[PDB]
Design a protein around this nucleic acid. Structure first.
Ligand SMILES: [Mg+2]
Ligand SMILES: [Mg+2]
Ligand SMILES: [Mg+2]
Ligand SMILES: [Mg+2]
Ligand SMILES: [Mg+2]
Ligand SMILES: [Mg+2]
Ligand SMILES: [Mg+2]
Ligand SMILES: [Mg+2]
Ligand SMILES: [Mg+2]
Ligand SMILES: [Mg+2]
Ligand SMILES: [Mg+2]
Ligand SMILES: [Mg+2]
Ligand SMILES: [Mg+2]
Ligand SMILES: [Mg+2]
Ligand SMILES: [Mg+2]
Ligand SMILES: [Mg+2]
Ligand SMILES: [Mg+2]
Ligand SMILES: [Mg+2]
Ligand SMILES: [Mg+2]
Ligand SMILES: [Mg+2]
Ligand SMILES: [Mg+2]
Ligand SMILES: [Mg+2]
Ligand SMILES: [Mg+2]
Ligand SMILES: [Mg+2]
Ligand SMILES: [Mg+2]
Ligand SMILES: [Mg+2]
Ligand SMILES: [Mg+2]
Ligand SMILES: [Mg+2]
Ligand SMILES: [Mg+2]
Ligand SMILES: [Mg+2]
Ligand SMILES: [Mg+2]
Ligand SMILES: [Mg+2]
Ligand SMILES: [Mg+2]
Ligand SMILES: [Mg+2]
Ligand SMILES: [Mg+2]
Ligand SMILES: [Mg+2]
Ligand SMILES: [Mg+2]
Ligand SMILES: [Mg+2]
Ligand SMILES: [Mg+2]
Ligand SMILES: [Mg+2]
Ligand SMILES: [Mg+2]
Ligand SMILES: [Mg+2]
Ligand SMILES: [Mg+2]
Ligand SMILES: [Mg+2]
Ligand SMILES: [Mg+2]
Ligand SMILES: [Mg+2]
Ligand SMILES: [Mg+2]
Ligand SMILES: [Mg+2]
Ligand SMILES: [Mg+2]
Lengths: 52, 51, 76, 64, 77
RNA sequence: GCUUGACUGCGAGCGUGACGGCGCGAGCAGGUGCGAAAGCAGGUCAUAGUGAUCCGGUGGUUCUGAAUGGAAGGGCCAUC
RNA sequence: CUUUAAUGUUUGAUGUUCUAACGUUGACCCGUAAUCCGGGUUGCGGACAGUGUCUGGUGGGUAGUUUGACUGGGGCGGUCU
RNA sequence: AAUUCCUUGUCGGGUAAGUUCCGACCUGCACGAAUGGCGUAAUGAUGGCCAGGCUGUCUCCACCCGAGACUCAGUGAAAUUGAACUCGCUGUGAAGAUGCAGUGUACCCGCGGCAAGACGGAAAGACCCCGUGAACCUUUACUAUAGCUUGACACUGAACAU
RNA sequence: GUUUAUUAAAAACACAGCACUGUGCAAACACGAAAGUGGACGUAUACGGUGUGACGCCUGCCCGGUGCCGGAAGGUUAAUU
RNA sequence: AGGACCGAACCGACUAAUGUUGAAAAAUUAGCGGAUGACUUGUGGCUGGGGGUGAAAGGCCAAUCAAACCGGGAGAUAGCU
RNA sequence: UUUUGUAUAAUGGGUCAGCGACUUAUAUUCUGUAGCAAGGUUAACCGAAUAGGGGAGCCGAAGGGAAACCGAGUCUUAACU
RNA sequence: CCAUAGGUUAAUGAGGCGAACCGGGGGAACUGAAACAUCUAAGUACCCCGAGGAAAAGAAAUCAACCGAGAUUCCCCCAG
C-alpha cells in the first residue's frame, strides 16, 4: 500500500473534518469538494489537510 | 452423595465425566477462559468513567 | 502441495418462495448477478439483492423477449 | 473470603433493567476510515450481550 | 563495617532496573572516607571514618560539638 | 455535459454467524447534485484489496475537574 | 544589523610548580617479649591514584527463560488470513 | 589412508581360493603443514596381517579323577501367583486360543530330565512420539547481571602560565 | 606414567620440548561484598594463560570475515549543564 | 648412573572361566602390568554443593552426582496415568 | 480399568482383616422450604447473655445516559412519526 | 616537654537458655499468569538483631470541606 490517507477539513472553522486517500504521484493540486458540515447543518467546501 | 456404587447413578466418576479438567483434583479453568482466545471482556473496548 | 484453499460459503439462494407473504424490506433472494430481476414492488440492492418494497405475496413470473425470470410483489 | 470481581469486565459491562448487560461495539478504534459510514454508524450505538456469553459475564460479575 | 561515625549512614539495599523494568537486588553504600580531623581543644589530629555528607555537617556543627555527641553515643572514636 | 450523494443524523424489516461480528435494506429528518420533469445519487457489475483489545498520539466538545476557581488528567466525538 | 578591533566578566581546556587532603605492601621510633595493627618521625607520590553516586561501552563470566501447530509416526519439505 | 561415497577402485605380493593385510597407482566423494605435516630407533596387557612351534580349538569326541546334580536323614528360602476340573488340530476372535466353534486324542498320580508355548519372570520402555514437562550445556536467541571499562559529581586544595 | 571406584586402560589425558601471548612486582591472575591470602618471602634466565606434544626434516599463501593490537583527525554518542 | 631390566612383598586391574536369589550390592581361580618412583602406605590436617576437586572420564565429593545429603517453603506443580 | 472394539496373549490384583478418596470455611447465584412483606434483615458490640438491646449498614420498591443531568421515562439527534 | 595512647588494680553490669506472639536488619523460589520476562506467589518461607508480658504505635506541621472532627490500637461496615 503506497496510497496515503488524507483529511479534508471544513473551511467554516468548526473543526469538523472528513478523511480519505489520494494518489501523491499524480494530482498534486489540493482537493476541494462541497460536503455537508454537521456543525453548521449545511454543505460547505472542504479543504485538504495533513493527518497528524 | 457421588461415588457410592452403581445404583446411586453417580459412582466411579462422581458426575465429572471422563478424564477432563473437571475430573482432576483442583482442576478447571479460571473465570472467563475461552479456550485460549482473549475473552469477550477483553475483545471489547473499555468505555466511560466513574463519577 | 500448493492448494487446499477456499472461502466460507455465503449462503446464497431463495429465502422466501412463491406465494409467501413478506414484509416490506425483506430480502427474497441473494445472488451473484441478476439471476432474478426486480419487478413490481421489489427493489434491487447494490449487490443485486432483491428486497420487497411493499407487503404482499411473492410471485415468480417469466416475461419479456429475453425469457428472463422476474420477481414481483402483489400488494393487496 | 469475599468474591473478587474481574475488574477488566467491570469496566466494560453495565447491568440493565431486565438483567442484561450492555457493551460498546468493537471494530471502531483505529482502522475505521476504510469502513463504510453505514458500518461505522451501526457500531456507534450500544449493544446487548448475547445469550451464549451471559453465563460467562455473570461469572465475572458476581456483585453486579 | 561501613558505618559513618557521624551520621550513622549504613549500607541499604535496592533494585537495579532496566528498560524492561527487570529488578535485581543491589546495595547502596555510603561515600565513606577516613579523614584526620584537627581538634583544637586537644591540639591533636583524630581520625574518623566519615561519609561525604558527614564532612559537610562537621563544618556547620563544629568539631567539638559533634565529638560531644559521639561521647554520648559511646562510639569510641 | 454538468458535478461531488465517495452526504450527516437515523432506520421499519430481514440475511448470515457459537460468539466477536459481517452483510442487505425501503422509508424518515437535515442539507445537496444532475435532470424540464417523472426521478436518480448513503461510492465503483457483484463477490478478494484485510487486523480485535490494551497503550500511546492528534483535533473537537460546557461531560468530569478529589476544599473552592481554574488546570492537569479522564470521558465523549472525529481520527492516527 | 553586519563586520567586528580592543575592553572586563563568566565558565571551561591544557601546561608548569607547590603541600596541606589523600596514598605509601619506603625508612625509623613507641605501644611491644609482636614481619598484625595503631601512633609518632621522615622520605616518596600527590590533587592524581583510589573509593561513592550517577552514567556510556563491554560482558555465556553468571542467571531466568523462549525456541509454534497441522502433518497417513516425527523430522525435512509444505501450509496457517 | 584411523579419512575413498561409488568400491570388494586398478595392478603387484602373500593363499589352492585373500571384500583383511603389504607394495604401488592417484580418479584427495570429503589429506595437508603447530586445531601441525612427513618420517622415526626404542617402548606398548596398542589395532590389523602373516609364518614356525604348539596343542581336544576343531575333524569328532572318548575315558578317567574330583565338586554338584540323584537317594536318605536334619534344618529350611526366594522371585511369582484373578481363579482353574490347566490336551491336539483347523477355523474364528482387541486381528498369533489350555478356556470360543468343529473335530481328534487322552485311565488316576508321582519321580528324573529338555526348555517349544503359556505374547514366561525381572523393571509404570531407555528407541519413537507427546506435555505450551524437568534439567544441565552452547551461541552473533531474548532480557538482565557480576566483573571490566568511560565520563560527571563528591572525598578534592593553592599558585602561575598560556 | 594417568584415566571412566562398579561393562571402555585406549590411538584418549598427561608428558619433556616448541611457539604465541599477558605480566615491572602494591605484578598480571585467582580466592574473597572487604580486609587479606595465594602467586612468592619469587622479579622477565620469573610467573600466568593458550595451543602443540621426544627426536629428525620442516611448518607454505590469505588480515576479506570474526577477534586482538595500534592510531585519533573527523562523524556519531550517556550522565551533567 | 637410571621415571633402566627380570622378579616376590606392595600396588595396580588386561584376558578367560565361574558366579548373576553371589562366599561377596563388583569378588574368586588361573594367567597379567608396575614393582627406587610422576612409587606406595600409616596417622593427622585443609579445600563444601552452582561449590569443591579433577595427569580431564562430566570423573569423584560416605553403595547416591550433567549439580551431594538433611530439613524447610511443601499438601510445589502434574491439561498426564 | 481403558477403549471404535477385550475370553483376549492390554493394565490391576497371592489371600484375608483393618484403613483408604467430592470435605471445610467464606462469598455468590439458582431451586426447594419457612417467616415477614413494599418492605425484609441486622453485623460488630452491649447483655445473665441462644433472650433482649444495637437498623451502623445491606438488599428491594425507577430507570435511562460515558457523564453532567433528566426521570416513567430516558438516551440517541438539530429534531425524531 | 606536657599530654595522649597504653598499662595495673577496684567496683558494678552483661554473657547463656527458652514455645508462640512483637519490633527491626536481610530476603527466595516453586507456583499463578493455562508458556514466559513486568506482575503474582510475598515482604510469605527462611536467616539475623532486640525486647516485653504484652510488644509496637501514640497526643496532629491529622482529617475534613467553608459544616466540623480532635492521640494511638482493635472490631464491624464503608467495599471487592
Ligand atoms: Mg448414570
Ligand atoms: Mg470428562
Ligand atoms: Mg478414569
Ligand atoms: Mg484536591
Ligand atoms: Mg544460559
Ligand atoms: Mg520460573
Ligand atoms: Mg507437532
Ligand atoms: Mg570402505
Ligand atoms: Mg589383488
Ligand atoms: Mg596401502
Ligand atoms: Mg586434518
Ligand atoms: Mg600455518
Ligand atoms: Mg595451527
Ligand atoms: Mg601393534
Ligand atoms: Mg604356529
Ligand atoms: Mg495351561
Ligand atoms: Mg489360531
Ligand atoms: Mg495350539
Ligand atoms: Mg517335575
Ligand atoms: Mg536343559
Ligand atoms: Mg534350558
Ligand atoms: Mg515378560
Ligand atoms: Mg512408559
Ligand atoms: Mg520413558
Ligand atoms: Mg508441542
Ligand atoms: Mg604404559
Ligand atoms: Mg570400569
Ligand atoms: Mg584407579
Ligand atoms: Mg577395564
Ligand atoms: Mg596433542
Ligand atoms: Mg585488513
Ligand atoms: Mg583482521
Ligand atoms: Mg623402571
Ligand atoms: Mg617386574
Ligand atoms: Mg615395563
Ligand atoms: Mg559414589
Ligand atoms: Mg540445580
Ligand atoms: Mg530436602
Ligand atoms: Mg508455597
Ligand atoms: Mg503432591
Ligand atoms: Mg466379546
Ligand atoms: Mg490376561
Ligand atoms: Mg500383577
Ligand atoms: Mg428460601
Ligand atoms: Mg439476638
Ligand atoms: Mg439507616
Ligand atoms: Mg423511549
Ligand atoms: Mg506459569
Ligand atoms: Mg516480666
Amino acid at each position: 500500500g503506497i496510497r496515503e490517507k488524507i483529511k479534508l477539513v471544513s473551511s467554516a472553522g468548526t473543526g469538523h473534518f472528513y478523511t480519505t486517500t489520494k494518489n501523491k504521484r499524480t494530482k498534486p493540486e489540493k482537493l476541494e469538494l462541497k460536503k455537508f458540515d454537521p456543525v453548521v447543518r449545511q454543505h460547505v467546501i472542504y479543504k485538504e489537510a495533513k493527518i497528524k | 452423595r457421588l461415588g457410592r456404587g452403581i445404583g446411586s447413578g453417580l459412582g466411579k466418576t462422581g458426575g465429572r465425566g471422563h478424564k477432563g479438567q473437571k475430573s482432576r483434583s483442583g482442576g478447571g479453568v479460571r473465570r472467563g477462559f475461552e479456550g485460549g482466545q482473549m475473552p469477550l471482556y477483553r475483545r471489547l473496548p473499555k468505555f466511560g468513567f466513574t463519577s | 502441495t500448493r492448494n487446499g484453499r477456499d472461502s466460507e460459503a455465503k449462503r446464497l439462494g431463495v429465502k422466501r418462495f412463491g406465494g409467501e407473504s413478506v414484509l416490506a424490506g425483506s430480502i427474497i433472494v441473494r445472488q451473484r448477478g441478476t439471476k432474478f430481476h426486480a419487478g413490481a414492488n421489489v427493489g434491487c440492492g447494490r449487490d443485486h439483492t432483491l428486497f420487497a418494497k411493499a407487503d404482499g405475496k411473492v410471485k415468480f413470473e417469466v416475461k419479456g423477449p429475453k425469457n428472463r425470470k422476474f420477481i414481483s410483489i402483489e400488494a393487496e | 473470603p469475599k468474591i473478587k470481581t474481574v475488574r477488566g469486565a467491570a469496566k466494560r459491562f453495565k447491568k440493565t433493567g431486565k438483567g442484561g448487560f450492555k457493551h460498546k461495539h468493537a471494530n471502531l478504534r483505529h482502522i475505521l476510515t476504510k469502513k463504510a459510514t453505514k458500518r461505522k454508524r451501526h457500531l456507534r450505538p450500544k449493544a446487548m450481550v448475547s445469550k451464549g456469553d451471559l453465563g460467562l459475564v455473570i461469572a465475572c460479575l458476581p456483585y453486579a | 563495617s561501613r558505618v559513618c561515625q557521624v551520621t550513622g549512614k549504613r549500607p541499604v539495599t535496592g533494585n537495579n532496573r532496566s528498560h524492561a523494568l527487570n529488578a535485581t537486588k543491589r546495595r547502596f553504600l555510603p561515600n565513606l572516607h577516613s579523614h584526620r580531623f584537627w581538634v583544637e581543644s586537644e591540639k591533636r589530629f583524630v581520625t574518623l571514618r566519615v561519609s561525604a555528607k558527614g564532612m559537610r555537617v562537621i563544618d556547620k556543627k563544629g568539631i567539638d560539638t559533634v565529638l560531644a555527641e559521639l561521647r554520648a553515643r559511646g562510639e569510641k572514636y
